[PDB]
Design a protein around this ligand. Structure first.
Ligand SMILES: *[C@@H]1O[C@H](CO)[C@@H](O)[C@H](O)[C@H]1NC(C)=O
Ligand SMILES: *[C@@H]1O[C@H](CO)[C@@H](O)[C@H](O)[C@H]1NC(C)=O
Ligand SMILES: *[C@@H]1O[C@H](CO)[C@@H](O)[C@H](O)[C@H]1NC(C)=O
Ligand SMILES: *[C@@H]1O[C@H](CO)[C@@H](O)[C@H](O)[C@H]1NC(C)=O
Ligand SMILES: [Ca+2]
Ligand code: NA
Ligand code: NA
Lengths: 432, 430, 431
C-alpha cells in the first residue's frame, strides 16, 4: 500500500512506487447540438422624400432609399415598414391627394399596393422639403428588421454529463482516468486514482478554418454572459427560427424639436427625424434605434473575452492510491451482438433506445460506433443511451462488429419533432 | 483485500469473494414541484358579416361566429378582439352610419358597448357581401387568445440533488448504494462501492397517471425548446405567473394585399373575407402565427423528447472488498422531543427542523421516513429539503412522535412573497 | 485499516482509533457576480382634468396630477404617457379646439410640445366634468413606467463549482476536507474521508448592515422561485439595464360602464377610468394596472420564504477511512514564481489566463492572492484559472510572494465587454 499526489500540469510525474506520468487532459461528454445562434440585430433604414411615391418597395423607392441596406433589411426577421404622408398633393396626381391617406392608408393602397403600413402624418413639420413653386410635397419612409449577419452566427454544442479525462502513462501503459473509470493496472497491482469532481456543463462555440471556443455553464443568461448568442436568436437547422422572438420594430416619425428626443428609444423602437435639405426638393433622415437587450453585440470581441481556447478543469492534484490487489478475471463474450435496433436521436439530449441479443459465454461489453453503452449478460438486452455519433451504427462486444438496424434522427430533426412549423390556417364558413 | 467490476444491467452478478447481484436501479432526489405547464396555444376565430351588428360579443354575434370556438377563445389568456366596419349603413339604423366608426369607434361604443376594439375599415374590399338592392353593408369580426386545452397541460416535477440508487444484494442481504452511502456489510467485512457520478437534474413530465423523463433543467435553447416548461407556467394549475406573450395583433387583410406574400409573425392574426356563394353572406380565412413559430403536438413531443425511465450512467461499479468492520457507535432509539418544522415541502427551499435529541447516543433523525442527518443529544437545528407533506412523524430509529408544523405546499410557496393580480390605485380630485 | 461514520451536526465527534471532531461546515466556489437585480415594478399615475392643459409634463399638470408619483414615474424605465382630449374647447383658447386633436395630436403638439402621446377621445363619457356655464371641457392624463425602488434591489452572486468544506479536528489538528482534497495526515499514516457529492450551484442574495441569503440552484425561473429578482430586471453595473425588458406600458382610457372592465388588464396594461366628481369642474381617476409576471413582488417577504440563512449541504454522515499508509515526500520549490502575467476577468465565470516561470527545486504549488491554481514543474507554465479576487495579484509557490503583472477587469466591465451600449444612430443623406 502506497500513496502520492500527482500534479495536473504538462510534464507532471511521480517515480515511486510505480512511474506515473501525466500525458494530457481531455474530456468526455454527451453532446446536445443546438444548431445556429446569433444576436438579435436590429437594423433600420429609410428616406425623407419630397414627393408622394406610388411604389412603396426597395425598387420603387430606389431614387431616395439606400439600395444595399433596403434589400438586406427587407429580407430580415420581423420586418416593419411605414410610409407617412407629411404633405400630400393639393391637386392632380394619381391617388396622391390628402384624402387617399386615411388612417391605415386603404384608399392609397387600393391604387398603390405595398407590404408596408401607410399612415397620414399631416401636422408634422414639412420644413425639410422646400423649393416648390406652389404645392409642397413630403413623405417619410422607415424600414426595420432583425438582420442575420453571417459573421455573427455561431454553431453551438452543449456538453452535458461532462467527465474530465486525466490521461496517464502508468509504468509505460496508457490509462484514461475519469470519475466513472478511476482504476489503472500496475505491473503487479492496481492504482486507484482519486480525482476532483467534473466541471459540470460546457458550452462549445464553433466559429467559422473551423475553431472551437469554450464556455463553462448552461450558459447563465442572467450574469456577465447575458449577451451570448445562445441567450438570443435560435435556429436549430441553421435556416428556420424557433422560440422567443422580439416583436416587430415600432417605427415612429419624430420631429426635430419633439421633447421625446430628450429620451432614448426603447428596445426595438426606431425613431426617424427629417433633416432639412441643403438642396431644393431633397431632405435627409436621422434614425435612432434602440437595440435588443440595450446593446449591439460585437461577435469577435464577445467570443475573445467570454470564452477560452480549451475547456476548463479543476487544478488538482490527483490522489494516487497504489494497491497490491489484482481485479478478478471475468469471462467475456467477444462475438458480435445480434438483431440490434437503435431508435431515437443522436446529439439531442434524449437517450436513444438500444435493444438486441447479447451472445453466450460471458458479458457483452457493448459499443455503438465505439461508444461504451455498458455490459450485458447473454440474451435479450434493452438500454437507454445518449449517442454522440450519427447512423449507421456498428455494434460490437469487443471483437468483430455488425451493422445494427436504425431509426435515428439528427439534432435539427429532433428540434422539429413534436411540432408543426409555420402559419396555422383556419376557415370560418358562411352559415347554411 | 479483493476487487471486481459489476455491470449495471438486469441479470448482472459477480461471485467472488462474496456474490453481489444488481437487484435494480432507482433514484433519490429533492423534488421541486412546478405545478402545471402547457404550450402557448394561439387560437383564433371570427366572422365576415353582411350587417352592422349592435352587440359585439359571443351571444350578440351568434348568427355568424362559430359558437363553441367563440366561448372558448373569449375565456382564453390575453384575449384580443376587433370589429371592423367595411361598409356601414348609408341611412337609418341606430349608431350604424359611417360617422359612428371614428378611429377607436368611441361613437359606436357609446350606444353599443363592447369589450372589443372597434375600427373603421372603409377602403377595404366589400366584394364578399353581395345581393343588396340599395345599401351594401359589411363588417368583420376577429377574436384570438392563448387557449388552455386540457390534453396539452402537463404536471412537472423538477428533480434536484439526484442520486442514482444501485440496489444490490450482497449474499442475499439488501444494500442500496449511492454517492452519499457507498458502503455495504459483507459476511466477514465491508464492501466499498465505487460508483459513477450522479446524472444531474431530471425533469418528470406527469401525464393525466404516467411519468415521462427528461435529463437536465431543461435546456430551452436546444432541441427541447418547445417543452411546455419553456412556455405557460401555472403553479397552482389555475393562475398564470411569469413570462407571457403580448395580446394577439389582429389585422384585416384583403385577398390581393401584398402582405399575404409573407407569413404572419408570432401572435399575429390576419383575417381575409371570402366571397359568399349565397347573397348577403361571406366566409373568413384566418392566418395565425403561433408562439415560438410552431404548434406543439403534445403526445408527439412527449414521445420523442422523453424516456420511460430516468437516465443513469452505463457503469460498471467498482466492488472494493475489505476485511475492515465499522466501529459500533451508540445510537439513541427514543423519539425526538419538541420537534418544530417550518417552511415548505417539494419547493426547493430547505425547511427548518428544530428540536431536542434524547440521551444515550446520536439521534439518526427521520422526518416521515426521510433521513435528515444524525444529531448528538440536546438541542438541534437543521435545514432540510422535504419531499413529504405535513403531518410530520419524527423518529431517531425507534418509536415515532408527531412534530408541530407550519409547512406550506409548492403552489402556496410559488405565491408567497407576491401579491397576485391587478394593482388598483385612486387619484382623488384636489 | 479502520472505519467509522462521523455525523455532520455541531457537537459530532468520534473517539477511536484517532479522535475526530466536526469543527464546522463551510464552502468553496467560483463566484460569478451578476451585479444588481430587481423586480419589474410597474407604477402608474394620472389625472382626470376638467380643462385642456397646454403643457403635458409633471410641472405643467401640477394642479391635477400627484406631484411625488409623477416625478418618480417620469424618471422610470420604458416610460409611457398619453393625454386624451374627451371634450375640447368649443371656441377661443390657444390650440385647444377639437380640430387640434387629430389622431396622434400633431396639430396640438405643434403649439404645445410634449414627450407624451396626444389622442382624441371624443365619444367617451364626459359626465365626470360638470358645472360648466356654456362650454364643458375634459381631458385625461395617464403615465406609467417600470420604477426602481432601492429597497427592492438586491446584489446577486452566483456560486459555481461549489465544494462543501467539512472542517475537521483530527486529534487537535485542523483538516479541511472536500471532494477535491479528501485526505488528512495522521501520525498513524493517513485518513481518507468519504464525502457526499457537492450541492451544485448556489445563489447568494446580498441584502443592504450587509446580510447574505441563500438559494440552491441556478435559480429555476420555471418553478416556485419564478418571482426571483434574478428572473427579472438585470443591471450588471447597478446603473445600466441589459437583456430582456418589458415593452412600454399600454395605456387605455376605459369608461366606467365599458364591458372590458369585467376582465383584468394584462401584464404592462394600464386602464384609466374617470370618476364622477363631488365638486364642480373636478374629477377623480381610477387606475387598474396589470403587473409584470401577474403579481407584485414583496421583497423582504420573498427573500424570507425563498432563501435560507446559510448555504445548503447534504446530511452526511462522512466515512472515515483510517490507513497506516504514509504519503511519499515530494520536493517543493519555495522561491516565488517569475514574470507572472494574469489576463482576463475575476468573479466573471470565464477562466483568466495565468502564465509565468516556475523556479527550480521542485514543483511550484502556485497561489494567486492565496487561491490554489495548481502545481507546476520548474520552467514556463500556462493555466486557465477562475479567479475570485480582484487585482493586484500576489503570486507564491508556498514561500515568499511577488507582484504579478495584470490586465484583469471586474465583473461589471466583463458584462459590457464585447457589446456597444445604447442607441444605434444612422443618417440617410440626400442624393
Ligand atoms: C432576398 O431574398 C430573395 C429570396 O430568397 C433573394 O432572391 C434575394 O437575393 C435576397 N436579397 C438579399 C439582399 O439578400
Ligand atoms: C486513452 O485515450 C486515448 C485517446 O483517445 C486512446 O488513444 C487510448 O487508447 C486510450 N487508452 C485506453 C487504455 O483506453
Ligand atoms: C433498499 O431499498 C428497498 C426499496 O426502497 C428497500 O425495500 C430496502 O429495505 C432497502 N435496503 C436497505 C438496506 O435500506
Ligand atoms: C482550515 O480552514 C480554516 C478556516 O479557513 C483555517 O483557519 C485552517 O488553517 C484550515 N486548515 C488547513 C489545514 O488548511
Ligand atoms: Ca367643449
Ligand atoms: Na401639398
Ligand atoms: Na353602405
Amino acid at each position: 500500500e502506497a500513496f502520492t499526489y500527482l500534479c495536473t500540469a504538462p510534464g507532471c510525474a511521480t517515480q515511486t512506487p510505480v512511474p506515473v506520468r501525466l500525458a494530457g487532459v481531455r474530456f468526455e461528454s454527451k453532446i446536445v447540438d443546438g444548431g445556429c445562434f446569433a444576436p438579435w440585430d436590429l437594423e433600420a433604414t429609410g428616406a425623407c422624400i419630397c414627393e408622394i411615391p406610388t411604389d412603396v418597395s426597395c425598387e420603387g423607392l430606389g431614387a431616395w432609399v439606400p439600395t444595399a441596406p433596403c434589400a438586406r433589411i427587407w429580407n430580415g426577421t420581423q420586418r416593419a415598414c411605414t410610409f407617412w404622408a407629411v404633405n400630400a398633393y393639393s391637386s392632380g396626381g394619381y391617388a396622391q391627394l390628402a384624402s387617399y391617406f386615411n388612417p391605415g392608408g386603404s384608399y392609397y393602397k387600393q391604387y398603390h399596393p405595398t407590404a408596408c403600413e401607410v399612415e397620414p402624418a399631416f401636422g408634422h413639420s414639412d420644413a425639410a422639403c422646400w423649393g416648390f413653386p406652389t404645392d409642397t410635397v413630403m413623405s417619410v419612409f422607415a424600414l426595420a428588421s432583425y438582420v442575420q449577419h453571417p459573421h455573427k452566427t455561431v454553431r453551438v454544442k452543449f456538453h452535458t454529463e461532462t467527465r474530465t479525462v486525466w490521461q496517464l502513462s502508468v509504468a509505460g501503459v496508457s490509462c484514461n482516468v475519469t470519475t466513472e473509470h478511476p482504476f489503472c493496472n500496475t505491473p503487479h497491482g492496481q492504482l486507484e486514482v482519486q480525482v476532483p469532481p467534473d466541471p459540470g456543463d460546457l458550452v462549445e462555440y464553433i466559429m467559422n478554418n473551423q475553431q472551437s471556443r469554450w464556455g463553462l455553464g448552461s450558459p447563465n443568461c442572467h450574469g456577465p454572459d447575458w449577451a451570448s448568442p445562445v441567450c438570443q436568436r435560435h435556429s436549430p437547422d441553421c435556416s428556420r427560427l424557433v422560440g422567443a422572438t422580439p416583436e416587430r420594430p415600432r417605427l415612429r416619425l419624430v420631429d426635430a424639436d419633439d421633447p421625446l428626443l430628450r429620451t432614448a428609444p426603447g428596445p426595438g423602437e426606431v425613431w426617424v427625424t427629417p433633416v432639412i435639405g441643403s438642396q431644393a426638393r431633397k431632405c435627409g433622415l436621422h434614425i435612432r434605434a434602440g437595440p435588443y437587450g440595450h446593446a449591439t453585440v460585437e461577435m469577435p470581441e464577445w467570443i475573445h473575452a467570454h470564452t477560452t481556447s480549451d475547456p476548463w478543469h479543476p487544478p488538482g492534484p490527483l490522489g494516487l492510491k497504489f494497491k497490491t490487489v489484482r481485479p478478478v478475471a471475468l469471462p467475456r463474450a467477444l462475438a458480435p451482438p445480434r438483431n440490434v435496433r437503435v431508435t431515437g436521436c443522436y446529439q439531442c439530449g434524449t437517450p436513444a433506445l438500444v435493444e438486441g441479443l447479447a451472445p453466450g459465454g460471458g458479458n457483452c461489453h457493448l459499443t455503438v460506433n465505439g461508444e461504451d453503452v455498458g455490459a450485458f449478460p447473454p440474451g435479450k438486452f434493452v438500454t437507454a443511451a445518449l449517442l454522440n455519433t450519427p447512423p449507421p451504427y456498428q455494434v460490437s462486444c469487443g471483437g468483430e462488429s455488425d451493422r445494427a438496424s436504425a431509426r435515428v434522427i439528427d439534432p435539427a430533426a429532433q428540434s422539429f419533432t413534436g411540432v408543426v412549423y409555420g402559419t396555422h390556417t383556419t376557415a370560418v364558413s358562411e352559415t347554411r
